[PDB]
């Protein structure tokens, strides 16, 4: 209710023209090998999905269109302190 | 064991740069030691004695000589010169808390002087 | 002491003291030997070197500062409960730890310097344990200044 500016920060594929590959010709921290955080320097996944093969409908499968790693849910908090290099976006 | 010290820093600036330390540093891991003290599994286990002192040891108690010394010069004038010497460092041993009380001194006079504070 | 005899190391490598996680907050309970632990920084100045501040201890281990050894100290002195041995249980009012300790302090003592029945065999010879008990290799984490 108060900003007069906008901003994002968030590591979503597709954002900044980032993918799952370019990261080495993106982020020069990670140019050297990486021999580190598991973090360090880390999706999209097929379309949207709904499978049901049951015959019971009130309860049916869902595929997400992106990923849901809920395993890692410090990665922002940790990504913010810059303990590790990582890709970063941001748009005003 | 994984290579020598290295300081790595390819950015234009150098207030922040990369550092590869000597040894590994496995911090996920940080319950390795408990863990291996119980002998819950077996491992790697190096034991190495080294010496630092010898002789005897000698203990003196300062309740008896409050006990004592209380008899033949009074109670205020033996709490005060206690307290003058328990206080020698420049910092109070008593309001230290208790897991960490152990401080020493340089050549210090015991007992003290005890003053005849007339009442 | 009988002569004076510091600490002769630079850094104390022990390694039965659980290391902080990787979270901020400890999962653990506190432990006071972290007060004397290098912490490892991935991002660092120009030409920084453990040499430079930190001495010859190697990094991830323990430093022991200047003032906790000294050629010239003398005499050790502490106000504490620790080192009593197992006629001292907690659970026993505090009458009766009064009394007890009132007790045992006359019977050990001559003049105001302790038998060497009372002092740990280690310390001195002849001693029995009966007023002060050893010390242990899991007492090093929440008492450095005793071991050290
Ligand atoms: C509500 O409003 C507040 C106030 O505006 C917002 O808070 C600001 O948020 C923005 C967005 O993150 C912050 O701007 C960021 O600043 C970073 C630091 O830049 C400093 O770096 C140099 C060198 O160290 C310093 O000398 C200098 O002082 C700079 O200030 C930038 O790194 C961020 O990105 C910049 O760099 C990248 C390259 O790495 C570029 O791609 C970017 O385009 C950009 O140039 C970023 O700009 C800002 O500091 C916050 N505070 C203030 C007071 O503005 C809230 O975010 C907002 N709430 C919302 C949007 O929900
Ligand atoms: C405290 O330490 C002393 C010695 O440092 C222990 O005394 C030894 O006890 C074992 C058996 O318990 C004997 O075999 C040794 O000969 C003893 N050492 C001597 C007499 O020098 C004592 O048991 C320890 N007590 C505790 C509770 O750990
Ligand atoms: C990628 O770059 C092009 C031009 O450089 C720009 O038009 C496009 O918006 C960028 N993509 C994203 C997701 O920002
Ligand atoms: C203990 O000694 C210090 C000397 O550094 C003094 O400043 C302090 O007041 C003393 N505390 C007492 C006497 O309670
Ligand atoms: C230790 O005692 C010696 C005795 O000569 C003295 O020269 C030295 O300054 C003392 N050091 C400290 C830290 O008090
Ligand atoms: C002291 O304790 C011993 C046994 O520990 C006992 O034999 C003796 O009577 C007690 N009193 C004196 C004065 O020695």
Same mark, same amino acid.
């Given at each position: 209710?108060? &900003?007069?500016?906008?901003?994002?920060?968030?590591?979503?594929?597709?954002?900044?023209?980032?993918?799952?590959? &370019?990261? &080495?010709?993106?982020?020069?921290?990670?140019?050297?090998?990486?021999?580190?955080?598991?973090?360090?320097?880390?999706?999209?996944?097929?379309?949207?999905?709904?499978?049901?093969?049951?015959?019971?409908?009130?309860?049916?499968?869902?595929?997400?269109?992106?990923? &849901?790693?809920?395993?890692?849910?410090?990665?922002?908090?940790?990504?913010?302190?810059?303990?590790?290099?990582?890709?970063?976006?941001?748009?005003? | 064991?994984?290579?020598?010290?290295?300081?790595?820093?390819?950015?234009?600036?150098?207030?922040?740069?990369?550092?590869?330390?000597?040894?590994?540093?496995?911090? %996920?891991?940080?319950?390795?030691?408990?863990?291996?003290?119980?002998?819950?599994?077996?491992?790697?286990?190096?034991?190495?004695?080294?010496?630092?002192?010898?002789?005897?040891?000698?203990?003196?108690?300062?309740?008896? !000589?409050?006990?004592? %010394?209380?008899?033949?010069?009074?109670?205020?004038?033996?709490?005060?010169?206690?307290?003058?010497?328990?206080?020698?460092?420049?910092?109070?041993?008593? !309001?230290?808390?208790?897991?960490?009380?152990?401080?020493?001194?340089?050549?210090?006079?015991?007992?003290?002087?005890?003053?005849?504070?007339?009442? | 002491?009988?002569?004076?005899?510091?600490?002769?190391?630079?850094?104390? =490598?022990?390694?039965?003291?659980?290391?902080?996680?990787?979270?901020?907050?400890?999962?653990?309970?506190?432990?006071?030997?972290?007060?004397?632990?290098? #912490?490892?920084?991935? =991002?660092?100045?120009?030409?920084?070197?453990? +040499? #430079?501040?930190?001495?010859?201890?190697?990094?991830? +281990?323990?430093?022991?500062? #200047?003032?906790?050894?000294? =050629?010239? @100290?003398?005499?050790?002195?502490?106000?504490?409960?620790?080192?009593? *041995? #197992?006629?001292?249980?907690?659970?026993?009012?505090?009458?009766?730890?009064?009394?007890?300790?009132?007790?045992?302090? +006359?019977?050990?003592? =001559?003049?105001?310097?302790?038998?060497?029945?009372?002092?740990?065999?280690?310390?001195?010879?002849?001693?029995? @344990?009966?007023?002060?008990?050893?010390? *242990?290799?899991?007492?090093?984490?929440?008492?450095?200044?005793?071991?050290?």
């Amino acid at each position: 209710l108060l &900003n007069k500016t906008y901003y994002t920060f968030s590591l979503w594929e597709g954002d900044c023209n980032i993918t799952r590959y &370019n990261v &080495n010709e993106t982020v020069p921290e990670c140019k050297d090998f990486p021999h580190d955080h598991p973090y360090s320097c880390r999706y999209r996944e097929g379309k949207e999905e709904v499978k049901c093969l049951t015959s019971d409908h009130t309860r049916c499968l869902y595929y997400p269109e992106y990923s &849901n790693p809920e395993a890692l849910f410090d990665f922002g908090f940790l990504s913010y302190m810059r303990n590790f290099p990582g890709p970063q976006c941001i748009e005003s | 064991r994984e290579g020598k010290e290295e300081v790595k820093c390819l950015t234009s600036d150098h207030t922040r740069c990369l550092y590869y330390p000597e040894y590994s540093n496995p911090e %996920a891991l940080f319950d390795f030691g408990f863990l291996s003290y119980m002998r819950n599994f077996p491992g790697p286990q190096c034991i190495e004695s080294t010496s630092i002192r010898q002789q005897d040891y000698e203990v003196y108690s300062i309740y008896q !000589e409050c006990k004592l %010394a209380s008899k033949t010069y009074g109670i205020d004038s033996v709490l005060f010169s206690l307290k003058n010497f328990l206080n020698y460092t420049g910092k109070p041993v008593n !309001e230290m808390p208790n897991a960490r009380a152990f401080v020493g001194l340089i050549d210090p006079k015991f007992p003290p002087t005890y003053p005849n504070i007339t009442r | 002491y009988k002569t004076p005899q510091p600490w002769p190391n630079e850094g104390l =490598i022990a390694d039965q003291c659980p290391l902080p996680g990787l979270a901020d907050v400890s999962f653990y309970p506190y432990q006071a030997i972290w007060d004397y632990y290098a #912490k490892i920084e991935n =991002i660092r100045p120009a030409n920084w070197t453990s +040499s #430079k501040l930190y001495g010859k201890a190697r990094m991830g +281990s323990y430093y022991i500062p #200047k003032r906790l050894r000294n =050629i010239n @100290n003398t005499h050790i002195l502490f106000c504490s409960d620790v080192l009593y *041995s #197992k006629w001292y249980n907690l659970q026993n009012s505090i009458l009766q730890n009064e009394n007890e300790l009132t007790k045992r302090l +006359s019977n050990l003592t =001559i003049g105001n310097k302790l038998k060497n029945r009372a002092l740990p065999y280690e310390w001195a010879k002849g001693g029995l @344990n009966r007023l002060f008990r050893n010390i *242990s290799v899991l007492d090093v984490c929440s008492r450095p200044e005793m071991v050290l």
